[model samples]
Target: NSFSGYLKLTDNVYIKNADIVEEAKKVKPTVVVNAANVYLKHGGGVAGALNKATNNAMQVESDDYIATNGPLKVGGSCVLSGHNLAKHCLHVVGPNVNKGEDIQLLKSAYENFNQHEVLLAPLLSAGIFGADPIHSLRVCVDTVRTNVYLAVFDKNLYDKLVSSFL
Candidate 1:
């Protein structure tokens, strides 16, 4: 689907995965506005990736959207984020526990697909959240092995990734 433009459609404080699909379809859009922590934190395993971005794109915290969107023949439970985990943020739990090599998991999540958008954020075990933002973010980026606006955190990381990936 093509995004009409950089439209800022405000997601409610809490919305469910089912509703997200309806909204996305209606818009037939690209950059729909969303607030993660409130609308998207469901589970913390590998299984959660099964849900399409459109299905769970807009989520809310209170909803019991199962972390296990579906099952995978290869991997175990997958982690995820939306309204439940952090406010206006996407919750991710991969790139491996240490952000090493999780290319398999990432690839599996995208197979049999075309014209889809995935959002991967870089988080860490340092600073306020006791997560090392730099390291965690890097691992997340490498795990997904893609350059995305959402994956970018700051200028330094962007420069390094651009120099290397480009």
Candidate 2:
């Protein structure tokens, strides 16, 4: 039994109910898509994580639609003055492990960025390694069209991401 359900549609779209792995393989399209995955090594401390979160938050907030909990400020390797940085000061738990914390960062990123007319998103080194950047991208595209600016760490990701969206 699978906890994740499945769905399909006509006009050439389809997906059958099955295991996630099987389902993933079964779904095919005219194009073969690929992406980078970022994961934390050593479960980076809260400070590191929040730093990443805040940095990204700041980038997106540079635009009008974005608003931070307060003025952007860095504290103890953590961002203590922002609202969406892992739901709290990310620096306290330095090199700590908490996947959920990262997810919260993504959540905040999506919500805050969505409100803006143009979102300039800087890639989070830690968040991009193990996680699918596409998920975050999709959230942005779904919420804000032509308004999301993705900061890429490499030329490859930049080219690929822009081409995919275009």
Candidate 3:
């Protein structure tokens, strides 16, 4: 029951560590935001998974935008249609590593989409950048003020997050 209970970490937050595509089907979130690189390519990490889930639609859109407007800077975000389960998608470029000092950047990125009534955010920087997963999750929880769903993929990291905060 803990896994189910984890979904409601607080009055306004839900944490889901399952496949984002499957979770999207069940929740139908208004928006789903994931970590993106400077080039705005969804080549790996949560963004890649999202692109793959949507049948590469996300990549096509993201790449098209990047090709025109240039790469996204750190903390800059690009908003796109969610294409299937969600109404929109936000691609935010988080710190490559050492995200502690740049928590404001992540915070600012969240500011871009935090207005949504329902949002699904990945634990940023814990993947390719190797930032501590727990730390990243804490920053996300602290920054998001509205109803939020955090999509996590690692089992051990999920357990640690639950025990540490839930």
Best by TM-score: 3
Best candidate (score: lDDT)? 3
Q: Give candidate 1 regions above 4 Å deviation.
A: 1-62, 67-95, 99-103, 110-151
Instruction: Tell me the tens digit of each residue's lDDT in model 3 across 44-98.
Output: 7787788888898887888888889999887778878888858888777777665
Worst 10 residues of 1 by lDDT: 7-16
lDDT of each: 0.31, 0.31, 0.74
151, model 1: CA deviation in Å?
4.9
Off by over 4 Å in 3: 1-6, 98-104
As a TM-score, model 2 comes out at: 0.34
Candidate 3 residue pairs in backbone clash:
none
Q: Write the per-residue lDDT of candidate 2 for residues 1-166, one digit (tens) a residue.
A: 1212322222212222222222222332111111111221123322233234444553343332223332321111212233332122211111111434354344433343333343223333234234455454544444433243233444555455555554
Sort by lDDT, best first: what order? 3, 1, 2
